[PDB]
Every structure is written in C-alpha cells, then in structure tokens.
Ligand binder design. Structure first.
Ligand SMILES: *[C@@H]1O[C@H](CO)[C@@H](O[C@@H]2O[C@H](CO)[C@@H](O)[C@H](O)[C@H]2NC(C)=O)[C@H](O)[C@H]1NC(C)=O
Ligand SMILES: C/C(=C\CNc1ncnc2[nH]cnc12)CO
Ligand SMILES: C/C(=C\CNc1ncnc2[nH]cnc12)CO
Lengths: 540, 540
C-alpha cells in the first residue's frame, strides 16, 4: 500500500486509536488530521476578529492608566514646566476621543492579551471536547457573543454599565450555571422556555448586529456614520474629513454652547468626501475576496480576505496603513517586526470581579449570555450530530452529555482567561464534512490553535477594515434562519421582526431578546387567557 | 326578496352596471360597496402617515419663511428695540433645531396641504383605475416611497441634496417615463433588468427602513437615539431628558469647542430616564392595538391604533399631548377645534421645479422612484389579478395595459398635487377578498377618500408616536418577502443581505438598491466571464 496507509492502520489498531473509536467510526488518522485542518481553516478568522472586538471593550484598564497631558500638545509632560503651563489630570473622558496615549497603550497590551486568551481558550475547549466528549467539534470564543460582550455589556472603552472584570465574572457564573443545568438534564426545559419566533430570529438579529458593527468605523469598514437628521447616513469619507460630536444646549433664538462633561464621540460625522475613504475600498476588496471564496466553497474564505486586507495595510506610508506615522503606530510596527513572539497574559487572566452581582445590568448580561449559549449550543451541537450521523431514532448522540459539559467548562475557562463565552463553532461542520468523526479532529484544531500562538505580533496588526467584511459576511450567513419564521402569521412575525430589528438598532442582543419575548407574551395574552378559561369551562 | 336585492338587480341590469361588467363578473352593487369599504378601511392609515412623512420633508418653504428672532427670547421681535438688542437674520440653520417659529408654521400649513394632496391624489388615482382600467384596485401615495422621498431625496426640513420642488419634478418625470414604457410594452424588459435577489429583498429593506423611521423620534415613537460610541442605543426617555449634538474639534490634550455653522441635531441623545417617555408607551399601546387587530384579521387595524393614540393625545395638559402649551400648540389646537374644514392646497400644488435635471442626485432619485414603482406595481398588480382570478393561462388579465397606464397617470397627478409617487395598494386584496371585481370598488374607495377631506383639522393633529407603530408594522408585513431568497446560495444571499441592510443603515432606498445591484454584478462577474468564454469556445 503506502506509508500513509501504514500510519493509518498503525494508529487505528493502537490504544489511542481505540480510545477515540477510530475503527468503530470508519476514519483513523489522516481523515481526522484533514478534518481538523479544514475546521481550523474555516474558523481561523476568530484569531483576528475576537481579539479585535474584545479589545474595543477597553480591557481591564481604567483612567488609572491614562497619563497626564500638558496644556499644549507641543510640550511633552516631562517638559511641561513653565509659565501658564500645567499638566491635566486624567478623568473618564481620557478613555474616549481624543484617546489618552496611556489608555491607547492599554488597548494594545490588552489586545495582545486577548489574542493569547482567544487562542488558549479555543485550544483548551477543543482539547476538552475531543477528550471528554470525543467529538469532531471545535470550540472558540463565540462570534455572536463577542460583540455583545464588548459593545453592550462592557461598552467601547468601558462605557457600559458593567465593567470588564464584572462582565468576566458574569461569563464565569454563566458557564457555571450552564454546566449545572446540563449536568442535571434541565437544559432542554429552559431551551423550551424561549418562544419559537424569538429563538429562531435571535440568530438573524445577531447577524444584523454583527453586520452593523462591520459597517461602523472603529469596528469595521465605515460606510455608516452619524447624521444630524437621520442618525445614520452614508459614511466612508477619509478619516481626515470625519469630525466628532458633543452635546449642546439650544435655546429660543439659536444660541448653542458646549455641555461640560459631555461624552464626545469618535470621528463619525463626514463633512465631505463620501465614498472616498481608501480603507473603505480596501475593506470592500476584502469583502469581495471573502464572498467569492464562500461562493466557490473555498475553505478559509474569511482568513484569505482578512490576510489580503491586512497585508496591504502592513505597508508603512499609505492611507490604508495599520501603522500610522505616530508613536502608537511606530510601537505597533516595532511589535509587528518580530514575526513571532511568546506573549503571556498579564492583564486579562484571573481578572474576575464579583462586585456587580447586586446590579441588575450584571444579571441582564448573565441571562443574555446564558440563553444565547443555551440556544446556540443546543442547535449547533444537534445540527453537527446530524451532519456526522451520530443521531439515533430517539434523538441522542451518545457523547452529548459530555459535549454540553465540555462547552460549559470551556466557557468557564475562557472567562478565567479573559474572553467572552466560548462556544462550539458551526464551522465544525466542515471537519464533519471532511470525514472527522472522533476527537482527533478537535485535537488537530487545538494543535493548529497552539501554532496560532507564537504569531501574536502578526495577529495584533489587523486593522478595523480587515475585521470589517468578516463581520458583514458572518451576518449574511446568520440571516438564513429567517426562512423558518411564519411571516404570514403576525403572532410569530411581529415578535420575530422585533427581535431581528432591535438588536442592531438598540445595538444590544439583550434588548432584542427582551423586546421580542415581551411582544410575544403580550400578543399571546388573549389566546392564553381564552384557553385558560376554556380549561376552566367558562367557554366552549 | 328585499330592497337590497332590488337595488342590486336594478344596478346590474342598468347601463352603468353593464359598463363595469357587474353581471359578467358575478357581483353587482353591494359587494362592490362592501369591497370598497373594506379596502378603504384597510388603507386609511395613509391619510395620516403620508401627510406626516411628507411634511417632515419641510414642504416648499425655505429660510424665506423664517422670521427674524430677537437676541433674548424674552423679547418678541416687534419689541426688539433697545441697547445691546438686535434682531437675528434667518439662515439655513433656522430650519433645524431650534426650529424657527416661521418655519414651524410652514410645516403646519404644508401638512394641511399634503393631507389634502394625499386625499386628492388617492381619489383621482382610484377613479382613473376604476373607470379606465375597471379594476377593484385602490391607489394612494406609496408607503415605501413616502419615506424615501421625505428623508432621503429631500431630507428632513429640506436637508437633502434635492429640493422639494425638484423632487416633485423628479416624480412627475418618473410618472411620465413609467407611462411611456408601459404604453410601448417595454416595462417587462426593465422589470427583468433588476437582479432577482435585489428585486425580492428591496421590499424587506424598505420595510426595515420604515420600521427604523417608526423607532426614531421626529418620525415615530422614539426607542432609538444617538450614542456617542455605538451611534444608536435605547432611547425612549422623556423629551425633557433629550439633548442635541453639534460637531466639535478635538485635539491632543482634550480641548473641544464648537464648530461654527455646524448642523445641530434634534433632541436625540438621552441623558437619563431611558424607557420612561410617556409617548413611547402610548405608541407601544397603539402598536399592541394594531398588532392584535392584525392578528384577529380586523380590517382597519392601523386606523384603530392611530385613532386610539391620537385621541389620547388630543387632551391638552398631558405629557402625551399633541397640542403643547405653546404658540404652535395653541394654533394647532385652534385648527383642530373646527372638526371639519375645506382646505385648499396653496403651497404644494403646481410646485414643480425643473432646476435639478442637471444634478446627479435628481437622476438618482428619479431612477429609484422609477424602479421602485416598476417592481412594486408589477408585483402588486399581478398578485391582485391572481387574487381576483383575472389571470388566464398566458398570464394577462385583460385591463392590465390600462391598469399600468392608470398607475402612471396617478403618479403624474400626485406629483402635480405635491405628493410622492402614488401606487396601487396591496391592501386592495382585502376588497378583492370581499368580492370586489369591477371598478365600482375603486369608485367606492374614491368616495371614502372624498369624505376624508372635510376632516383635515382632525387629520393634521396626529402626533409622531401615532405614526409610529403603523410604520413598524408596515415593516413587519414587508419583511415576509425574505423567504423567497435562497440564503444557502451566497451569490443570492450576499446581494439580498446588502439590499436589506443598507436601506435602514444608510437610511436610503437608493443606496440599498445600488449596493445590492453592485454586489450582485461583482459576485457574478466570474460566472458571466466564464460563460462568455465558453460561448466563444475557449472553455468546455
Ligand atoms: C440667545 O439667548 C441666550 C440667552 O438664553 C444668550 O445667551 C448668552 O450666552 C451665554 C449664555 O447665557 C452668556 O455668556 C451670555 O451672557 C448670554 N447672554 C444673554 C443676553 O442671555 C445668547 O447670547 C443669545 N444669542 C444671541 C445671538 O444673542
Ligand atoms: C447565537 C450565536 C453565535 C455565537 N457564536 C457561535 N455559535 C455557533 N457557531 C459559531 N461559529 C462562529 N461563531 C459561532 C449565533 O450567532
Ligand atoms: C416597494 C414598495 C411600496 C410602495 N408603496 C406600496 N406599494 C404597494 N402596496 C402598498 N400598500 C401600501 N403602500 C404600498 C413596497 O414597500
């Protein structure tokens, strides 16, 4: 035969091959390696997107890491000694535009931390799933929950109601609760708790939310900016023609003056040059690359698009550069220069904080995480079992108990490492489509994630317009769930429509879920009361 | 038999009954009256929503109708004579927040004009369709095109690139072109020009656009406001806790000062009291009323919800009042006091302006109007013919030629009266579902619209939170078209997703269409080139 067949037979007939049930499942070693390679190539975009999104949250640092600034920018603080010259003490506004250099350096260190944390949490989840559940499933920080954690629970640069550490405690407790309810068989009852239209359309809502993030500026390619009249219009002007906003006080004659302490925004309003930003068009080229690769069923479509946009942005003196001619850009380029690095999580690891348990926002975030993970993981795991043909007549696929326990454990470990909940990835289907049936697929994906480390300098240099199209296309793939809604029935269409449309518009997964569930409950009050009376016998 | 049967027989056997083919279509007079009544009850929400949306556009008046204001609001301009006191000449900013009282009085006069114009254009379109095409179809200002005309082509208070008069010229020429292409049988070829995913998903995009309008403040119930970080968050704080924004200049230390001439926004940013606006909750109650009425198949659901919210808002000293204790509110209440009035269009009639033909924005608006009307009217008319069983094996329904000519004529007449394009309403199906088969249904709807006049004082008093839920639910009904998209196919899902998501996010129907069509063309370039080469024989 051949050396490849020799290896396959040897591993299949060895103790480790019997542990993973290779012979019992009709695939021994090279199919597992290929399935893991395919799954990793399909899910590798997470290595960029998750760290970018979570770093936008600001990480663990506060105003305590903002450096005092001199009155005039021409004078560095160490030379800020003279007449009429004073250092400005940092306040909360130092976190936002214009961002304090100390806080800007935070986000870079935290982005390195979160790259490593994404890789490590994915590796640990993959290994636990492959060993304890023996399934060809890859686990990684959840794409939908990433944006919710960063921009809703914590907020851009920590502008939300819950701090980053408190949100990590929320994710830790959510993983513990998910593990507990899975261990007692109580997960399916809570899965049936959510209304069907809300459950089905939450995926479409999260997809629209992610796509909207991909069309913003600090998160994606631009193309959506501020409008004084409509609140949103066509952006994609160059960064040099974008301006910030501040709250003002009007009057009955027309006088308008600044509001002290108002939260100034990013450069979101275009004064001219619409549809002329070079980074928007580079992001569009990356979008086209990813879309053709998806159409052609080219595994690694998103990775190829991100890599193209990033490689174009790695040149140093262009208008699409990831390393602008600044101190922050020079430092980012210096880190990028070392192609490989062994970064150690110094900020986000063990950064849990249980201060917010008494706050209602903590429990809103906790419940949203819990139910997103419940519904998502149930649907994905059973879809993957159907793909692998592990589902029997009764509907169980053997290692499901340990599959859900492994997912909950991965969530807890990721919370400890400093990342949003980690979940089983639907992209695992690719590895299942390639013949992966045992846990060796997950071990292969874990080894690929291990190789993803040592390349933090290369992954920390990914600009927003590279994250960009991956977000928009993840939204596109998530929209396919709308077809399962009865749009001719208003009792299902109205709650489903509310769930889809509130997530991007209120910009919050939790608000979309609350609005959809509340509209469902209100619209079914009449039917429920009628049926209750009929049960009591009042009505026939 | 009975007097009703006597009337039915008499009319069916009379000359007018034979003109409308009553006997030939198995319905004589009372079925036509009931079908017209049902169609009117279903489509009567337009009498509020269209005038509200088009008045938000600012109408025909400019800064020329802004009154000069004194330096201090305590002094009326006529008493603005003294030391250090000067009248302020009005500029463009007088149109926006804080809105000049003269310009505020414009919008009220123009809203009366546009109520009358909506009613008159609907009446004329209905009569032309009933007589020249002899179909049970009701025509009225198009719901989708209303918002596009007001908030994109013209802009809130005329902040767009095309003036109101130039946009009316665009609608006039669009109606002329539609009539021309219909008269030469060239309409179906242009209908096949648009890609299938774009054509199908434009309806979902317009629905999302209308729903987003219904969740804004000057247009709907609130619940979506400005966010410095995310550009959109949960609004629905009271108007007393909302503040405006102005562009500012940042620096490298933190200094931020106002930008002279910047376009200040409305009260869109909530400083506190989220989810506490009484008008938001009144709008939610109206939404619940409309949603139950839709669920219960109660004709006139939207009218009932609008009427409830409006009647609650007609009380004078509440936080949800349509007549605040101001000069504008006192005048609005004085007009509302006269329950009936015969208003004469004094501003928007014959207000066409052909100055912008050389502008590219004029032609963008013209083409968007033309293709929205083409696709919409084709789909709706053929759906209505299928409902009425007027479609034969070949696919023609007899009066289709004159149906499309009547629609184009109605568009031209509405442009002359000062309203966005008028279209055949899908709500006509209700009248078709009630047995309406001849043009007497359209004549009945026209008579009901005639009765709608004489109630302009009653219709000009409808607040935003009443328009509100009707917009959101129109979006809900429009979303049902997504199920016709192959979401597993990326060449159809990506263009469809772009079309749906760009309309609310860029806040423009034209941009959604352009983005969707461009993405479709780009994603099919490879296939088209491959097939062209195969035709040339280069490839097998
Ligand atoms: C419009 O009226 C306001 C008062 O409501 C004027 O406010 C001035 O600007 C600030 C705010 O009080 C103070 O420094 C001035 O003393 C205010 N003056 C007065 C007379 O209130 C504002 O100046 C007025 N606008 C114009 C153009 O005169
Ligand atoms: C509802 C949740 C998604 C959370 N994360 C993921 N859940 C399932 N599969 C994935 N592939 C990439 N990310 C994910 C669906 O968006
Ligand atoms: C694509 C266009 C709609 C324009 N107006 C209308 N087009 C067709 N039926 C209707 N009923 C109410 N408004 C309309 C679909 O939103």
């Amino acid at each position: 035969p051949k050396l490849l067949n020799r290896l396959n037979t040897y591993v299949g007939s060895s103790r480790v091959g019997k542990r993973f049930k290779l012979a019992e499942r009709n695939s021994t070693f090279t199919t597992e390696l290929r399935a893991g390679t395919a799954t990793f190539l399909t899910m590798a975009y997470i290595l960029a997107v998750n760290a970018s999104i979570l770093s936008d949250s600001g990480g663990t640092c506060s105003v305590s890491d903002c450096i005092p600034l001199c009155s005039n920018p021409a004078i560095e603080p160490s030379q800020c000694t003279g007449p009429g010259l004073r250092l400005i003490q940092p306040d909360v506004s130092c976190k936002f535009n214009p961002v304090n250099p100390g806080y800007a350096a935070c986000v870079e260190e935290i982005r390195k931390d979160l790259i490593v944390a994404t890789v490590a949490a994915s590796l640990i989840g993959c290994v636990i799933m492959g060993l304890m559940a023996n399934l060809p499933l890859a686990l990684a920080p959840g794409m939908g929950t990433n944006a919710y954690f960063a921009y809703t629970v914590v907020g851009f640069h920590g502008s939300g109601s819950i701090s980053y550490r408190t949100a990590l405690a929320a994710v830790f407790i959510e993983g513990l609760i998910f593990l507990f309810i899975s261990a007692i068989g109580f997960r399916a009852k809570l899965a049936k708790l959510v209304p069907k239209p809300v459950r089905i359309s939450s995926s479409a809502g999260i997809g629209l939310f992610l796509a909207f993030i991909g069309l913003q500026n600090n998160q994606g390619i631009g193309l959506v900016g501020y409008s004084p009249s409509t609140l949103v219009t066509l952006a994609a002007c160059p960064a040099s023609s974008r301006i910030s906003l501040a709250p003002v006080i009007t009057s009955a004659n027309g006088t308008v003056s600044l509001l002290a302490g108002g939260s100034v925004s990013g450069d979101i309003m275009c004064i001219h040059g619409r549809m002329e930003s070079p980074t928007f068009w580079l992001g569009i080229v990356g979008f086209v690359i990813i879309a053709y690769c998806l159409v052609k069923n080219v595994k690694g479509a998103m990775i190829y698009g991100i890599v193209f946009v990033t490689a174009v942005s790695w040149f140093r003196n262009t208008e699409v550069t990831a390393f602008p001619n600044t101190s922050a850009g020079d430092a980012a380029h210096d880190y990028f220069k070392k192609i490989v690095d062994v970064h150690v999580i110094k900020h986000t690891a063990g950064a849990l904080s249980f201060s917010g348990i008494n706050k209602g926002h903590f429990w809103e975030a906790l419940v949203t995480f819990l139910y997103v993970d419940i519904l998502d993981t149930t649907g994905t795991l059973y879809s993957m079992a159907r793909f692998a043909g592990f589902v029997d007549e009764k509907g169980d696929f053997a290692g499901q108990y340990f599959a859900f326990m492994s997912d909950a454990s991965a969530i807890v470990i990721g919370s400890l490492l400093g990342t949003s909940p980690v979940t089983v990835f639907i992209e695992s289907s690719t590895g299942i489509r390639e013949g992966g049936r045992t846990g060796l697929t997950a071990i292969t994906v874990a080894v690929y994630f291990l190789l993803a480390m040592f390349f933090t300098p290369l992954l920390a240099s990914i600009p927003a317009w590279a994250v960009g199209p991956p977000l928009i296309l993840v939204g596109v793939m998530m929209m396919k769930s709308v077809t399962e809604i009865d749009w001719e029935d208003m009792r299902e269409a109205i709650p489903a429509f509310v769930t889809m449309i509130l997530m991007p518009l209120t910009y919050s997964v939790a608000y979309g879920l609350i609005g959809g569930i509340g509209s469902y409950v209100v619209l079914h009050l009449w039917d429920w009361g009628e049926e209750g009376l009929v049960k009591l016998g009042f009505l026939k």
